[PDB]
Amino acid sequence: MKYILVTGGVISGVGKGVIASSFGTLLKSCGLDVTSIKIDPYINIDAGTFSPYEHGEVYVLDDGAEVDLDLGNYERFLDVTLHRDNNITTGKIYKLVIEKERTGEYLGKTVQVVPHITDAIQEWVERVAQTPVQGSSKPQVCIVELGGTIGDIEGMPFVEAFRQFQFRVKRENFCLAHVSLVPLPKATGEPKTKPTQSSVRELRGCGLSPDLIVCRSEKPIGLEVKEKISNFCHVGPDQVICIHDLNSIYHVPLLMEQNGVIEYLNERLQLNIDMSKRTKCLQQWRDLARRTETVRREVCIAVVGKYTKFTDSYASVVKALQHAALAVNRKLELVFIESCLLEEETLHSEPSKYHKEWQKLCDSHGILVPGGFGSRGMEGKIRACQWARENQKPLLGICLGLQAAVIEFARNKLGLKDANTTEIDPNTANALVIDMPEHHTGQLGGTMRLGKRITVFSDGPSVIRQLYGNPKSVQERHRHRYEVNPKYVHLLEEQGMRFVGTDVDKTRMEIIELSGHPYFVATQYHPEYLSRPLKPSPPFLGLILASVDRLNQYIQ
Amino acid sequence: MKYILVTGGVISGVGKGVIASSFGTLLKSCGLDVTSIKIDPYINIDAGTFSPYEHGEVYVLDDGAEVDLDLGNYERFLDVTLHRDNNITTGKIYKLVIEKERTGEYLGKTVQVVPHITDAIQEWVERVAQTPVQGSSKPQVCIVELGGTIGDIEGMPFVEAFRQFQFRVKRENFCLAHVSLVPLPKATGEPKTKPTQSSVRELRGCGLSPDLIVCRSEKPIGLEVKEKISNFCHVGPDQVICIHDLNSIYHVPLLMEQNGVIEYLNERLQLNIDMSKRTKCLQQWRDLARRTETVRREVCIAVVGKYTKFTDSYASVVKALQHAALAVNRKLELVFIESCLLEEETLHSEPSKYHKEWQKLCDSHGILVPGGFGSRGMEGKIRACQWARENQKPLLGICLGLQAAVIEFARNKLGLKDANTTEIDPNTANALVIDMPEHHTGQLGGTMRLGKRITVFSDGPSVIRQLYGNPKSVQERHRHRYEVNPKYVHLLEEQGMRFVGTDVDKTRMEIIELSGHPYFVATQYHPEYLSRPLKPSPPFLGLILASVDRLNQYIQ
Amino acid sequence: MKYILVTGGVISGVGKGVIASSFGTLLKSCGLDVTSIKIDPYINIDAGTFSPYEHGEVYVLDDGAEVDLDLGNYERFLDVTLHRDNNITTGKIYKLVIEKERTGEYLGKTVQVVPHITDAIQEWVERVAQTPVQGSSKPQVCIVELGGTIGDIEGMPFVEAFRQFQFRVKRENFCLAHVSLVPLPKATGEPKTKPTQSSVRELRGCGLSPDLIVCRSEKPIGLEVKEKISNFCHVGPDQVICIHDLNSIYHVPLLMEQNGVIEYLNERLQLNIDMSKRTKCLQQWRDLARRTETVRREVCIAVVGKYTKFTDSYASVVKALQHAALAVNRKLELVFIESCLLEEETLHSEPSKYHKEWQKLCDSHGILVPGGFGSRGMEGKIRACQWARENQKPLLGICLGLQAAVIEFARNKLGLKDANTTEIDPNTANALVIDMPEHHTGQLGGTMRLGKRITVFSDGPSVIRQLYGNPKSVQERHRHRYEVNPKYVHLLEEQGMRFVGTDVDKTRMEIIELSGHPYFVATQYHPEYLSRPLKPSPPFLGLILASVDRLNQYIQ
Ligand SMILES: O=P(O)(O)Oc1cc[n+]([C@@H]2O[C@H](COP(=O)(O)OP(=O)(O)OP(=O)(O)O)[C@@H](O)[C@H]2O)c(O)n1
Ligand SMILES: O=P(O)(O)Oc1cc[n+]([C@@H]2O[C@H](COP(=O)(O)OP(=O)(O)OP(=O)(O)O)[C@@H](O)[C@H]2O)c(O)n1
Ligand SMILES: O=P(O)(O)Oc1cc[n+]([C@@H]2O[C@H](COP(=O)(O)OP(=O)(O)OP(=O)(O)O)[C@@H](O)[C@H]2O)c(O)n1
Ligand SMILES: Nc1nc2c(ncn2[C@@H]2O[C@H](COP(=O)(O)OP(=O)(O)OP(=O)(O)O)[C@@H](O)[C@H]2O)c(=O)[nH]1
Ligand SMILES: Nc1nc2c(ncn2[C@@H]2O[C@H](COP(=O)(O)OP(=O)(O)OP(=O)(O)O)[C@@H](O)[C@H]2O)c(=O)[nH]1
Ligand SMILES: Nc1nc2c(ncn2[C@@H]2O[C@H](COP(=O)(O)OP(=O)(O)OP(=O)(O)O)[C@@H](O)[C@H]2O)c(=O)[nH]1
Ligand SMILES: Nc1ncnc2c1ncn2[C@@H]1O[C@H](COP(=O)(O)OP(=O)(O)O)[C@@H](O)[C@H]1O
Ligand SMILES: Nc1ncnc2c1ncn2[C@@H]1O[C@H](COP(=O)(O)OP(=O)(O)O)[C@@H](O)[C@H]1O
Ligand SMILES: Nc1ncnc2c1ncn2[C@@H]1O[C@H](COP(=O)(O)OP(=O)(O)O)[C@@H](O)[C@H]1O
Ligand SMILES: [Mg+2]
Ligand SMILES: [Mg+2]
Ligand SMILES: [Mg+2]
Ligand SMILES: [Mg+2]
Ligand SMILES: [Mg+2]
Ligand SMILES: [Mg+2]
Ligand SMILES: [Mg+2]
Ligand SMILES: [Mg+2]
Ligand SMILES: [Mg+2]
Structure with missing residues (x-):
């Protein structure tokens, strides 16, 4: 078994996941089976209790585990299906070890970080790396991504673990890549190398030595900076890969092939790849990266959300849209609108912002309402759906635009002024959105409708069903705690x-449609999780098509 | 005695010197005498062997010590004159200690870093802090700036020293300010706080605790980032000063007064300042910062140099020009031209660059040629002077534009094709620039004509003498190793x-003038070192005036 | 070239030098040429300014360099002659680097610990390892001993240096041995392993990994402690050598051969030793270790000194005596007497101590007076010589017993009551001991009569000359600053x-003899420095023989 460990330097958000996915797709293009593991040193059994501000848009697997978006990137790049054990955390490790100790599996011995926590980590990695992930394929390489920055207090065990692992698995089966930021401050006037030097020093102060250093910068760096890094960090100049900021991440693997990463990995890990064969390996990514540069049609979409100050809180969503617009041969122009500025309280405190955001909303071609939690920014998310309804503008809603749209329809058609949520006001007369008491145990964490569930369309042709290929069923990933009231169903259906x-069982609503309206589709699930570069998701496809008035033509 | 220590975080070039100078000028405006010390952990007795790429434009004091530009900033802000002992380095400390040990001043004892190196450091600081610096004034506060980043291997002694010093001088006389970078990477999408956290952790791992944290960013940061820093670095929210990138540094002290630094320092160090008195303290800096925003005249100057890829290699020069253009009530527009692109070798390899740089040079209003060393980029520095000569364009030359201009005049008027330098070709027939053998001992380091020397103008009114106030003498700082050949003097004088x-003694040339030409002045010394915000330097003044055709009017 | 680095753990004085010498003699017995280097991280160009309390009895080489006793052990074990460059220190390194920088050998670059100090260290080691040391032999292995404990602030450069060196010289030519203390506190009740664990952690935190761990204890440790060390320090159980406290150090190499160090070093460094040949390699050390256990004669010697609270302040001396008593087939019984207790001031403050020490002195068979400095304990060192003179007891004096004896002879025979030293009273009428003004420059350090000088005996057979083999000359190592007054010479000679x-030149006295007395020999030089296990030193030989009344028999 072969292992590639990807560590981080100065900051989180430096780009480790993209680098890991790129390694994976390079190796997979040359005829190797690859699996991936993500280590997150935070004390959390899963990321289901995080805000999107914390680490960017919780991702959900099929089994129903909330994880980091790096696993979404793995899935999108390598076309795999990962599980709850591909995400290791300190909480899980400590819980497991404490349980084993309270059972008596080390009776007589003192349980310490070394050897026990590190042993557990190595056993977990060994176990999961051998597990087939795209069928019963036998994985030959595992990409492990260590989250956070080297030096964090939480990740000292893991580092130690791997310092042992490299001697447990015979250096010629283990390689390390350190991704570090190279900043260029405007007032300083030059790219700075000291943070990378200090990160590599901290890494070597734990028994590990980099085999590759990936320098991340906004712009490309000269050979002088490369030489400085190679000399003050003690690796060869051929072992310094400089990955700058690019338009799409499809360019990252290519830029790696352009720098000789395949040859180095075949020489270092002894993969025995026949290279007269391997040409045209990355033709898929070449075609994608090119087509992403040749499209000039400018479809403009609005995303009305409450986390819009940190765009990575909608990563999946964004990418989904892209995967659609590129298959329709269009160029996406994304507009982020903060929901609270669509509300009338801003018209009495900051009217300029109100009118500017409403201008942005009205001069677009399609609206996407994403999911959310809480009560901050939903009364403008209501008005967006109301406007798109009363003005015939395509619309897709995702797990809270559905509920917002239902409440809006109620309050604007059925004269139900108090139609509201339990999440906002639980003591409301007309409760259109209610609590599912199977997932309201008080124990927040794992207590959500999660994972892939089955869809069944009611009888009667539906545009959204024709976009799905007119099947009887489809599996889709859910993540939610509330649900529309089944009682009021027919009062809206009439x-x-x-x-x-x-x-x-025909009592939990998950889709809704507006007749007469071009496109007003809403899904309680998240269709953003199964969209892929060469396999877009039908709802976003239809949204784009309606936004370019090509939906009926594509239907026929 | 009171002490303010200024430490650094993530990178060098973060802004410690500006912060120290701002503290100094704030305290000095409220009626306190201030001195300054700079500690540079590099193993060098002075910065005379550095390239400008390394640490930005060696500065020279009156005594003749080559130092960092932070001392230039101290001098410009506080109006002081500093000495060779205001610059401590590891080389000096180790040399002194080794000498004392080889004498027998610790006979019987093992000489170690602790206690001996740290003791030496504390004794030096104690000694120099009490030394008058603006006369025989008795200093009441010393600002010590520790160079580099906390964590560097070279600065561990110093840190330790100060950890002891704070108990030697009674916490209520000691305060620490940590200047740390808060980056905002484009692809990350948020200001990052982890580097500051890690720097403060490294600092606390050496026994020191910050009393102020100064966060440096390109743009202002919100209260959320401030709260994160205050919580994860364990200081009060009133102790987090956020200094972003500004148009001029004159704004920095004001922005500090706006954040309550004076009150905090009066409460923490017990300065006993009467504040009903202190209003209008910073009126000078207010006037300067304002006038720097109200000037719309756009005088455009060219700087033809060989270090133009790193602008801080001409800091003093730049500032000098500014101090002039603001007193003339003009706005400066600086153009940096690389000299090698003015040479014909680029016309046969990259003609576009050649013609673009020549366009930049020809569409300006004045030319400044700075100093330099070596042979890379002088044959275009020659052509710049030649063009300005044959096209009647104002010109100021600084310590190598003088020699370039002399060689150009020779080769273009006296038909001396081989007129050249010894620094380029020492075996040339016509050597216009020769070696001063008193400063050519082979021992490079301190072996330069350095420091303030006396000027004497030849008889006969001179515009450059009228700009100096028509005196008989003036003291100016020199830094050079070569000198124009006195033999060829009259061959150019005719x-x-x-x-x-x-x-x-009337045998070492230091100024030259071209009759008929509006302004073609050159100085072998550096007039950039004594320019001040409210006391510009006459040569730059005349350059600007000639560049706006206001020189004769100002003369009369 | 092959390198064996010997590092230290918990304390200094743990036994690194003995281990290094044992490695050397093992490799040399199997047909390999070995050289040795000692690194001392203290800031001292040499140990000539130390007290014997600091690091145990300064040793002197032939060239005249004052060094640590580990080099004495190297010389005694391997039969080599070392030089001033076999002793690296931080002071030397920093002086050399600062000189090179003030010359201009890194012009343009910032001089830092990394790379420059570490480079200097590696260049020095490379250079000295190739230098022949026992003729023009070509060394094949170098044993480098890093002084102090891993973790000391002074030795961080060196560690870093070697972390690079191991990749510069191809792991298969580099091996590391870590010597660590395993204490057994009486009240704790078990051998403790945590200090060794922490030392190995600190070592690995600098990029180095042990290939051998040598555990030092007073008594042997069980296999349980060995297993704990092997598991918690991550080496193989065959790589844990346990060296306990032994009667003689001759047993150390044998105990190493008994644990398979030769085979491990031949397998790890690829020495290609033919082992069917190597049997009987350590027969010398076997014979010595045995004979050190079969001698039952109990010759009792007194050592009257002023550093007697720390016995290692006379190491060489002690060993010299041993090397003699074993060749005479006698067992040595050493008594250490503090000189200040022989003085009358103790008879009026603590008479019991006075009388007890005088009892110890009078019930012995021979007296040895060692060297010293200062004035603390010389007026009892005078009385010891006086007693041995007036009671016919053999006596050897070493570089201060000579001066003490001369002063005693003066004050007790020539009625010169004020006969004294300049080191005690420089303004004395009768100055028997005067200052050599060639070595009194004020600059203490290197300013001593040092190194090997030539001897010439006056004409007239002398017992001490017959013990030297009746030659005309002999070279002996000196270390001194004062000298007996040549003027009073004949006043004692009559x-x-x-x-x-x-x-x-026949004007500097270095030996003296008393006629009629059995043995009263004194040497201004140190004959202790050239004594070897199988080549004793003639003065100590004669002292022992006289102490057993076998001197005249051995003469004939
Ligand atoms: O400017 P000051 O006021 O802080 O004064 C400064 C700045 C820097 N230094 C020292 O020079 C070496 C390299 O410095 P340096 O930060 O530039 O690292 P590097 O290798 O060049 O990487 P990078 O590209 O990031 O710059 C280090 O030993 C520093 O301790 C000193 O003594 N005083
Ligand atoms: O993204 P990955 O792939 O690296 O996965 C990541 C990223 C981050 N973390 C952990 O969360 C905490 C704060 O992280 P964090 O870097 O954001 O620090 P902070 O306090 O928030 O300051 P800052 O503003 O700079 O962000 C730390 O304990 C990290 O170790 C984990 O476990 N996996
Ligand atoms: O007794 P207290 O009052 O201090 O309470 C103590 C003593 C020790 N410990 C922990 O047990 C582990 C091994 O301890 P330990 O010192 O014995 O190391 P080791 O591996 O066994 O080597 P060693 O032979 O030197 O003992 C360590 O994780 C300690 O932190 C605790 O929690 N409380
Ligand atoms: N043997 C045993 N030990 C227990 C049990 N429950 C708790 N312990 C603890 O676990 C320790 C076991 O450690 P061991 O090193 O095997 O000591 P031991 O139990 O006496 O077993 P021996 O050393 O073979 O005699 C005991 O000392 C107990 O303090 C139990 O049910 N059986
Ligand atoms: N006294 C003395 N010591 C010297 C001289 N030159 C080098 N040294 C060394 O410096 C050391 C002085 O340390 P001290 O602790 O004072 O020991 P001491 O010199 O014997 O002085 P006392 O302890 O008072 O007897 C000596 O041990 C010498 O090894 C010298 O000229 N005079
Ligand atoms: N060239 C030169 N530099 C000196 C001399 N004395 C001190 N220096 C300093 O050492 C530095 C040399 O560094 P370099 O990187 O070679 O810069 P340079 O001297 O301009 O040489 P080039 O980069 O080739 O133009 C110069 O910038 C000076 O500041 C000298 O005599 N000659
Ligand atoms: N080379 C790159 N160019 C542009 N954006 C990038 C690049 N690498 C990563 N990114 C983006 O930066 C963000 C952070 O990357 P991510 O993989 O989450 O890093 P990490 O795991 O360190 O947090 C993501 O939005 C990612 O798409
Ligand atoms: N607040 C600021 N806004 C703009 N430029 C700044 C600011 N602070 C510092 N600078 C500039 O940044 C550069 C680095 O500052 P400097 O004082 O040399 O810092 P340090 O001592 O950390 O290297 C200088 O050119 C300085 O003028
Ligand atoms: N195995 C041992 N048994 C007995 N004494 C020893 C042993 N090893 C070393 N010693 C003695 O301990 C002292 C310290 O050893 P030394 O070689 O000076 O160690 P280091 O270089 O760590 O200070 C010396 O007197 C030495 O002879
Ligand atoms: Mg992240
Ligand atoms: Mg964060
Ligand atoms: Mg909330
Ligand atoms: Mg700087
Ligand atoms: Mg730098
Ligand atoms: Mg040069
Ligand atoms: Mg020792
Ligand atoms: Mg000691
Ligand atoms: Mg003394």
């Missing part, structure tokens, strides 16, 4: 609202 | 070249 | 004092 989808 | 200045 | 030796 109007321009139609439930074209629900669960297998 | 033409449009005139030596309006030389030393007291 | 009595029972006779100068049987002096320099080549």
